[PDB]
């Protein structure tokens, strides 16, 4: 409604019903699998029974209407579950469940996005409730919408430090339309939870973290209901104390059954079990939000004008990076920005001063940024671009692999790439970002040579489906492309060429232009060099590399300032590996590094003008 | 001594004339390099004075001896206090202060373990505990000694997940040899840090996880000595109320200062400030530790006996993992062994069987396991082996990464690589994990094909310095090499030849048996294919690749159960590319998989034996 209803006893033995025919479905779905984790479900059968069937608000026939309540399975391998709930809300036909796992089937091991009733897949644990943040934020900020977030975690997973970022953040932003909701069933996979049934300690975490924390008995559908009822002004935690494998005889509270589906013979009697306790076949219904969700536009979004860069004049591309998107932010609402307390550093803050109600500060947490970011994105909400150092991105990675596995559209700028950012030394040098990005299967990376290719990258990632990568960097360079000069996803430019050239040096920022500054040391001794600038480096634009290549004698010498495994080089040489006379040489950061001037670094480690210089005269020689 | 000291009126006054030298330095040095973090120094000086000159026992002239206290400066851009404090102490020259991030010195920008005062390097923002509390894990389990272990934090820093990840380990494991000095300066780098000078809030943040807290004046030397004289039978945490950019007038507890050095003409203002409040120049002394920690052997370490495999029988390499690591256990022990809550799926839970006092249980808390790794492996008092599964190795990157960059020796061994793990789906499977670990410049890649390789995979990795990763896989598959077969690094088999070979077909692990099921399907049409198991990745045995090649019309066909990008197609393509009459042509999974049968699966995603067969007849055609 909007007043709780309190349930009488048959509503309360329906739920109670509800929680066991959802106890027989995970069991047998799983048994017919082979696999699964019927034990993971029936902690969570009365939890699951409850949200769906008293306290959220939803079409049933509608999974992803945006006026809906989120649900968010954060311990995704009670995945049998939240099927059965979808089935018996009306939405999945009931026979389907059984080909659970099956290769004929869209209800895989777990929740993946190809299910109308899953926004974000989760099976890496700890990753949902930062999902579920960035959802909660955005309906309270964004939409401005009367919908709730709901996301169940397990005991075992609190041991991952996303979560406590996300529990941090909830507290931040004063979260207080989020419920977590903990399955505290004392036991994960090979061994007890740390914490197993000291509920009090529990309690205390999540209170000193800022959350209104509540402990239930989480196989009590009335303390579920009245728990769920009460709307708080904080974040709520419901701390539910319940049995791992609540309801098979002989099984409920034991270790070594996590993940272990029972076999045949033991189903049929647990099932027949469990099907003495229901009262009544009788199904309750789903009960509908309110659509107070607002429309958002779908278009395509363009820059206001062209760039208003000068050749020959130097900028960085972290800081044209941060003028682009701030540029960005006025054509279209959508857009969103996150950082990791590196604001002043990538230049995300020009967004924040020009759009400050759209950026999310979101602290030293790059994992739970990622997943804001996706939580953001999810249902076409908004448009999120996130930033910090490259180097820090790799903290994230498994948040961008689940993101990529979520069919996200999220965009990343990751700044200060390589050694060139000089004399903080390593831990600031991102070498190894275009390996991790490309090993992404839905990505796109950009690597924008001067401020007119960053502007245009930050324009084309916007509409560009999947997880797009901004490969920024710390010093400046010479703007080298005129303002309209075209770009496109998967199109390299030559910027030097001869009819004399002999080699087709690729280099990218840095790299780029040291490659210019080598070809004006090779002309004095009369040596002309093709230099080609790849503007992506997934996709490469492999046919202007072969035809770049034939021109120079078929050789290519690719320069970055990355390691050697994973990177530029590496994405050429895949690319053209057997063509004839097609040769690939290569200069990359071959070891950790060290402190210095960026010039000098650049020089130590081989891929400067002089190390480009020596590279091409000896393939001439 | 062992009695807590208690400090007269002078000694408290060296030690604040300590920390204003310290102050002094910290300026100086930054505004001569033109860069770092003064402000973040100044903080932290008194805290700096007190343990460096109070409260730690440590050998000045011999930072690395295995008796000293040891101290983790997890806030790693305070590098030139770090660096101030060693010359303070006799070791470094204080001319050398001076050289701070220049090419020519070792005191780089973050610090490193080319420095013998550093155990491992830090700059990535919350991973110093977890080193930390590996150190002191070491001290009360392994070495049983008396050597305290003292961790410094940023409160912006604080937000790190990993960081609260550490803070449950060190109260689970009673880690009452521990303290975290927590630099409550109330800023982060471009904003306050979320909860300022809330100290209760951070005090009851820090018990409810199970902490011994302590709230002080972080710039009283007196309130310092006493927090720090007395030991508890918990982890302590030092809750330091400080000023960031303390005693630098104009700019103690500023915005717009983090990683801003003073300019020549404000520092000279300002160091003559600080100056005039020292009362004598007279240095103090460090004092030395009781010398209790044990010797370790350092020999080459040497599995019992051959492996015990027979040809044609089958088991998977996850579990011939445990056996051989559990086999080595018994050969030296000096081998310990940590898994995040997958032990029973790793197969790690048989050397917990067998070596339980070896064994450290981590919980769903993947980055935390690694820096206990890295902390364990400091000064070799011991030799890691960390497992999972493959897949979540990557929400640890950025602490593998670290781990490079620290000189770590630690081993890693990732599960259920690729989709032929089956009906999980793609949140379990690894597909990116070569990528990665190619990326870490120190690593060395193992991919055993069977249970032989995979027990002599275990025993180089023990015996080989930097990161090694050991990648297995979760069906079974026969076994193929002779139990005395020789194994080396970088070298990989030939497993399949005839004189009529038309392909040289590269597979590993499950595609490599897929390969040998593809040869017994082509040989019916009278195709001859030669197949070649890599055995490592990297580095890939090039010369035999080659000549491999060479002996099947230049053909090579790589065929992986991995992404595209980064990994063994990519790395083979690398390492030929330009060879005459060399083509490598390439099966991969192209796209984020689902779920179904491992068989299903490996055909969906074109990597099966029907897979192979086909691409070897279009080449030969
Ligand atoms: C980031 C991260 N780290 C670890 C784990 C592993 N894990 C889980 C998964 O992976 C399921 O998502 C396993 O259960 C996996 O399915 C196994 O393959 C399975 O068990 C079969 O083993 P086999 O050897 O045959 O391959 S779930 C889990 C424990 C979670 O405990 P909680 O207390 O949080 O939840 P509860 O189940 O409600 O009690 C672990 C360690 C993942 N997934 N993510
Ligand atoms: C995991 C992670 N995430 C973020 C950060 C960035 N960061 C810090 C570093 O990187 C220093 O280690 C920067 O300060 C870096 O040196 C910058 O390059 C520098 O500031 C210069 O900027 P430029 O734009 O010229 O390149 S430190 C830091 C804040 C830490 O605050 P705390 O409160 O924890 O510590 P305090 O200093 O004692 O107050 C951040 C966000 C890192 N490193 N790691
Ligand atoms: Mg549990
Ligand atoms: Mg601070
Ligand atoms: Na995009
Ligand atoms: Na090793």
Same mark, same amino acid.
Not at 39 to 51: D, G, N
Not at 400 to 422: K, T
Not at 587 to 601: D, H, I, M, T
């Given at each position: 409604?909007?007043?709780?209803?309190?349930?009488?006893?048959?509503?309360?033995?329906?739920?109670?019903?509800?929680?066991?025919?959802?106890?027989?479905?995970?069991? @047998? /779905?799983? +048994?017919?699998?082979?696999? #699964?984790?019927?034990?993971?479900?029936?902690? =969570? !059968?009365?939890? %699951? *029974?409850?949200?769906?069937?008293?306290?959220?608000?939803?079409?049933?026939?509608?999974?992803?209407?945006?006026?809906?309540?989120?649900?968010?399975?954060?311990?995704?391998?009670?995945?049998?579950?939240?099927?059965?709930?979808?089935?018996?809300?009306?939405?999945?036909?009931?026979?389907?469940?059984?080909?659970?796992?099956?290769?004929?089937?869209?209800?895989?091991?777990?929740?993946?996005?190809? @299910? /109308?009733? +899953?926004?974000?897949?989760? #099976?890496?644990?700890?990753?949902?409730?930062? =999902? !579920?943040?960035? %959802? *909660?934020?955005?309906?309270?900020?964004?939409?401005?919408?009367?919908?709730?977030?709901?996301?169940?975690?397990?005991?075992?997973?609190?041991?991952?430090?996303?979560?406590?970022?996300?529990?941090?953040?909830?507290?931040?932003?004063?979260?207080?339309?989020?419920?977590?909701?903990?399955?505290?069933?004392?036991?994960?996979?090979?061994?007890?939870?740390?914490?197993?049934?000291?509920?009090?300690?529990?309690?205390?975490?999540?209170?000193?973290? #800022?959350?209104?924390?509540?402990?239930?008995?989480?196989?009590?559908?009335?303390?579920?209901?009245?728990?769920?009822?009460?709307?708080?002004?904080?974040?709520?935690?419901?701390?539910?104390?319940?049995?791992?494998?609540?309801?098979?005889?002989?099984?409920?509270?034991?270790?070594?059954?996590?993940?272990?589906?029972?076999?045949?013979?033991?189903?049929?009697?647990?099932?027949?079990?469990?099907?003495?306790?229901?009262?009544?076949?009788?199904?309750?219904?789903?009960?509908?939000?309110?659509?107070?969700?607002?429309?958002?536009?779908?278009?395509?979004?363009?820059?206001?004008?062209?760039?208003?860069?000068?050749?020959?004049?130097?900028?960085?591309?972290?800081?044209?990076?941060?003028?682009?998107?701030?540029?960005?932010?006025?054509?279209?609402?959508?857009?969103?920005?996150?950082?990791?307390?590196?604001?002043?550093?990538?230049?995300?803050?020009?967004?924040?001063?020009?759009?400050?109600?759209?950026?999310?500060?979101?602290?030293?947490?790059?994992?739970?940024?990622?997943?804001?970011?996706?939580?953001?994105?999810?249902?076409?909400?908004?448009?999120?671009?996130?930033?910090?150092?490259?180097?820090?991105?790799?903290?994230?990675?498994?948040?961008?692999?689940?993101?990529?596995?979520?069919?996200?559209?999220?965009?990343?700028?990751?700044?200060?790439?390589?050694?060139?950012?000089?004399?903080?030394?390593?831990?600031?040098?991102?070498?190894?970002?275009?390996?991790?990005?490309?090993?992404?299967?839905?990505?796109?990376?950009?690597?924008?040579?001067?401020?007119?290719?960053?502007?245009?990258?930050?324009?084309?990632?916007?509409?560009?489906?999947?997880?797009?990568?901004?490969?920024?960097?710390?010093?400046?360079?010479?703007?080298?492309?005129?303002?309209?000069?075209?770009?496109?996803?998967?199109?390299?430019?030559?910027?030097?060429?001869?009819?004399?050239?002999?080699?087709?040096?690729?280099?990218?920022?840095?790299?780029?232009?040291?490659?210019?500054?080598?070809?004006?040391?090779?002309?004095?001794?009369?040596?002309?060099?093709?230099?080609?600038?790849?503007?992506?480096?997934?996709?490469?634009?492999?046919?202007?590399?072969?035809?770049?290549?034939?021109?120079?004698?078929?050789?290519?010498?690719?320069?970055?300032?990355?390691?050697?495994?994973?990177?530029?080089?590496?994405?050429?040489?895949?690319?053209?590996?057997?063509?004839?006379?097609?040769?690939?040489?290569?200069?990359?950061?071959?070891?950790?590094?060290?402190?210095?001037?960026?010039?000098?670094?650049?020089?130590?480690?081989?891929?400067?003008?002089?190390?480009?210089?020596?590279?091409?005269?000896?393939?001439?020689?």
């Amino acid at each position: 409604m909007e007043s709780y209803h309190k349930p009488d006893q048959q509503k309360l033995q329906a739920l109670k019903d509800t929680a066991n025919r959802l106890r027989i479905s995970s069991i @047998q /779905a799983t +048994t017919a699998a082979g696999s #699964g984790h019927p034990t993971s479900c029936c902690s =969570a !059968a009365e939890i %699951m *029974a409850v949200l769906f069937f008293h306290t959220m608000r939803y079409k049933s026939q509608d999974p992803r209407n945006p006026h809906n309540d989120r649900f968010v399975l954060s311990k995704g391998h009670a995945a049998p579950i939240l099927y059965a709930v979808w089935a018996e809300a009306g939405f999945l036909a009931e026979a389907e469940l059984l080909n659970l796992r099956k290769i004929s089937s869209d209800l895989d091991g777990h929740p993946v996005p190809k @299910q /109308a009733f +899953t926004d974000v897949a989760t #099976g890496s644990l700890g990753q949902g409730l930062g =999902a !579920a943040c960035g %959802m *909660a934020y955005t309906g309270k900020y964004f939409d401005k919408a009367s919908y709730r977030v709901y996301c169940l975690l397990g005991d075992g997973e609190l041991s991952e430090g996303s979560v406590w970022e996300a529990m941090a953040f909830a507290s931040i932003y004063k979260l207080d339309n989020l419920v977590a909701i903990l399955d505290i069933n004392r036991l994960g996979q090979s061994d007890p939870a740390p914490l197993q049934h000291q509920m009090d300690i529990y309690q205390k975490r999540c209170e000193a973290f #800022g959350w209104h924390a509540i402990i239930v008995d989480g196989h009590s559908v009335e303390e579920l209901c009245k728990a769920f009822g009460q709307a708080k002004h904080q974040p709520t935690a419901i701390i539910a104390k319940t049995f791992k494998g609540r309801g098979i005889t002989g099984v409920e509270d034991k270790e070594s059954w996590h993940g272990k589906p029972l076999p045949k013979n033991m189903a049929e009697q647990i099932i027949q079990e469990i099907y003495s306790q229901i009262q009544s076949k009788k199904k309750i219904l789903a009960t509908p939000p309110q659509e107070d969700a607002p429309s958002v536009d779908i278009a395509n979004i363009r820059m206001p004008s062209l760039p208003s860069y000068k050749v020959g004049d130097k900028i960085a591309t972290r800081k044209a990076y941060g003028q682009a998107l701030a540029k960005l932010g006025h054509a279209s609402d959508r857009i969103i920005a996150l950082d990791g307390d590196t604001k002043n550093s990538t230049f995300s803050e020009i967004f924040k001063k020009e759009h400050p109600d759209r950026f999310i500060e979101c602290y030293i947490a790059e994992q739970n940024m990622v997943s804001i970011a996706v939580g953001c994105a999810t249902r076409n909400r908004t448009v999120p671009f996130c930033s910090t150092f490259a180097a820090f991105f790799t903290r994230a990675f498994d948040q961008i692999r689940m993101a990529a596995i979520s069919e996200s559209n999220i965009n990343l700028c990751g700044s200060h790439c390589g050694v060139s950012i000089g004399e903080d030394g390593p831990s600031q040098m991102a070498l190894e970002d275009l390996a991790m990005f490309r090993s992404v299967p839905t990505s796109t990376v950009f690597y924008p040579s001067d401020g007119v290719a960053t502007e245009k990258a930050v324009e084309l990632a916007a509409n560009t489906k999947g997880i797009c990568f901004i490969r920024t960097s710390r010093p400046e360079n010479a703007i080298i492309y005129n303002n309209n000069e075209d770009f496109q996803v998967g199109q390299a430019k030559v910027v030097l060429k001869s009819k004399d050239d002999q080699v087709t040096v690729i280099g990218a920022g840095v790299t780029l232009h040291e490659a210019l500054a080598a070809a004006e040391l090779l002309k004095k001794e009369k040596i002309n060099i093709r230099v080609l600038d790849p503007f992506t480096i997934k996709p490469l634009d492999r046919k202007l590399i072969l035809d770049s290549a034939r021109a120079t004698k078929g050789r290519i010498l690719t320069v970055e300032d990355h390691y050697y495994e994973g990177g530029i080089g590496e994405a050429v040489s895949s690319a053209v590996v057997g063509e004839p006379g097609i040769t690939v040489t290569h200069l990359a950061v071959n070891r950790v590094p060290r402190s210095g001037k960026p010039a000098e670094l650049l020089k130590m480690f081989g891929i400067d003008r002089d190390a480009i210089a020596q590279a091409v005269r000896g393939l001439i020689t």
